[PDB]
Amino acid sequence: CPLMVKVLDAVRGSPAINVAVHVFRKATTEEEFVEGIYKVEIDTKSYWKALGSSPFHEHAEVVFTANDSGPRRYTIAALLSPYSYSTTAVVTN
Amino acid sequence: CPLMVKVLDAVRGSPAINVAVHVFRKATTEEEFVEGIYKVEIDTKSYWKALGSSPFHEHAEVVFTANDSGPRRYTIAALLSPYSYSTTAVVTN
Amino acid sequence: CPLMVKVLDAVRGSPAINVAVHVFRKATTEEEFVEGIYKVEIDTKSYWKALGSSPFHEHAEVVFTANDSGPRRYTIAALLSPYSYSTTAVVTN
Amino acid sequence: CPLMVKVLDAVRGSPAINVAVHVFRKATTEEEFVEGIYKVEIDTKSYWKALGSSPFHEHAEVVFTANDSGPRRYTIAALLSPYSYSTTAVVTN
């Protein structure tokens, strides 16, 4: 039972490529698989995550306040987008 | 029982490509598979996530306040969009 | 049962490529696999994460205040986007 | 059961490539695998992380205040994006 994978075998020219090839062959127990390829996070927020095993167990008093306030400019040209013969310009006068 | 996969075998020219090829062959127990390819998160918020095993068990007093307030500009041209012969410009006068 | 993987075998020219090839072959117990390739985080925030084993157990008093306020400019051209014959310019007059 | 991987076998020309090839072959117990390749973090913040085993156990009083305020410019051209025959310029007049 052979397995064969061909991706972009013969490439002639000047391309602009993003390639992600994931080949997986397999064969109280737990197994976890977390694969992440080409992940972009520009403005990402996580406040409470994975607090753990029994936090704040007894009479916890938590006062959490969060403010997202301010001039923030995120100017991106060609995010995760390859180009071959083009003109990518960010002109901020 | 052979398995054969061909993606973009012969490429002549100047393309702009995003390629994601995932080949999977298989054969108290738990198995978890989490694959993420080409994930873009510009403004993503998660406040309470995966707090864990028995948090805030006994007489918890939590005061959570969240405010999203402010001038934020997210100017993106060609997000996850390859281009071959084009003109991608972000002109902010 | 042979396994064969070919990616970008014969490349003639001047391409601009990102290649990520992950080949996986396998065969109280726990196994965890975390693979991350080409991960970009421009403005990423994590306030409370993995606090551990039983933190803040007894009569915790936590006052957390967070403010994101200020002029911040993130000007990016060609993020995770290779280019072959192009003109990437960031002109900030 | 042979395993064979070919990536960019014959390259003729002047490309600009990022290559990441991860080949994995395998065969109270715990195993953890954390692989990270091509990770970029421009402005990344982690305030509370991995606090440990039972911190702040008894009558903790924590006052945490955080302010992100100030003129910060992050001008990047060609982030994680190789180019072959191009003109990458950051002109800040």
Author numbering:
A (entry chain C), B (entry chain E), C (entry chain A), D (entry chain B): 10 to 36, 59 to 124
The authors write:
The four structures determined in this study vary in the assembly of this gate, and we classify them as the closed gate, the open gate, the absent gate, and the broken gate folds.
The density map from the second 3D class obtained from the curvy fibrils from ATTRv-I84S patient 1 was determined at a resolution of 3.1 Å. The N- and C-terminal fragments have a residue composition of Pro 11 to Lys 35, and Thr 60 to Asn 124, respectively. These fibrils have a crossover distance of 608 Å, a twist of −1.41°, and rise of 4.8 Å. In contrast to the closed gate fold, the gate in this second 3D class assembles in an extended conformation. This open gate appears twisted by an angle of 180° from Gly 67 backward, resulting in new interactions with the N-terminal fragment. Based on the position of Ile 84 at a hydrophobic interface with Leu 58 and neighbor residues, we anticipate that the mutation to serine could disrupt this interface and then favor the extension and twisting of the gate. By tracing the fibril segments contributing to these two map densities back to their respective micrographs, we observe that the two polymorphs can coexist within the same fibril. In the open gate fold of ATTRv-I84S fibrils from patient 1, the gate is extended.
